[PDB]
């Protein structure tokens, strides 16, 4: 079934909302503040984020911006007292929330969430961290952006030109030596065994 993240700070409310979804076959994790929300987003995968706007720590709008920047396409539903796919005013009927969640999910029912793990690597875009078999590998911003694209291709081949468009600038001056030296540095950082394969005329890919 569906897994959602509920971020709401009002006492008992986050737990009560998860409770109302339980028998709707919609499971949920909860958080009362933005720091906990980000920590959960670094570890678990969710189908939708339900975010109260005014919460302690990083606000609900700041969480929404970081989800949007992650490039996952995960739908976001904001809760308001009274960017984002939809907004819901508190208090709301539970059937109303379950309807919005299902509608948001089925719009993208056949799309796939990003590939963040392959061949031992785990990539977390929220903390911008890479783990190889559980071992932390520090990476520069450019190295991470290139690796993020290669991992998301799940062994598919990515040209040096696409890496330049996606990790430097969509209308960049097509010079690919910078991409080549960055991939080479990434290979040194990741270590043995070799995980980034070169396809001579086309580009690079994650091996196995
Ligand atoms: Mg609040």
Numbering used by the authors: 0 to 81, 94 to 219
Question: Can I see the authors' text?
Answer:
VanR is composed of an N-terminal receiver domain, which contains the conserved aspartate that is the target for phosphorylation, and a C-terminal DNA-binding domain, which enables VanR to function as a transcription factor. Upon phosphorylation, VanR is thought to dimerize, bind to promoters within the vancomycin-resistance operon, and activate transcription of the resistance genes.
X-ray crystal structures were determined for the inactive and activated states at resolutions of 2.3 and 2.0 Å, respectively. While one might expect long linkers such as those in the VanRSc structures to be highly flexible, the linkers are well ordered in the crystals of both activity states. In the structure of inactive VanRSc the linkers from two adjacent molecules in the crystal lattice associate in an antiparallel manner, leading to the formation of a symmetric pair of hydrogen bonds between the carbonyl O atom of Arg123 and the amide proton of Arg123′ of the symmetry mate, along with a similarly symmetric pair of hydrogen bonds between the side chain of Arg123 and the carbonyl O atom of Pro124′. The main structural differences between the two activity states center around the stability of α4 and the oligomeric state of the protein. Comparison of the two structures illustrates that phosphorylation of VanR is accompanied by a disorder-to-order transition of helix 4, which lies within the receiver domain of the protein. The inactive conformation of the protein does not appear intrinsically unable to bind DNA; rather, it is proposed that in the activated form DNA binding is enhanced by an avidity effect contributed by the receiver-domain dimerization.
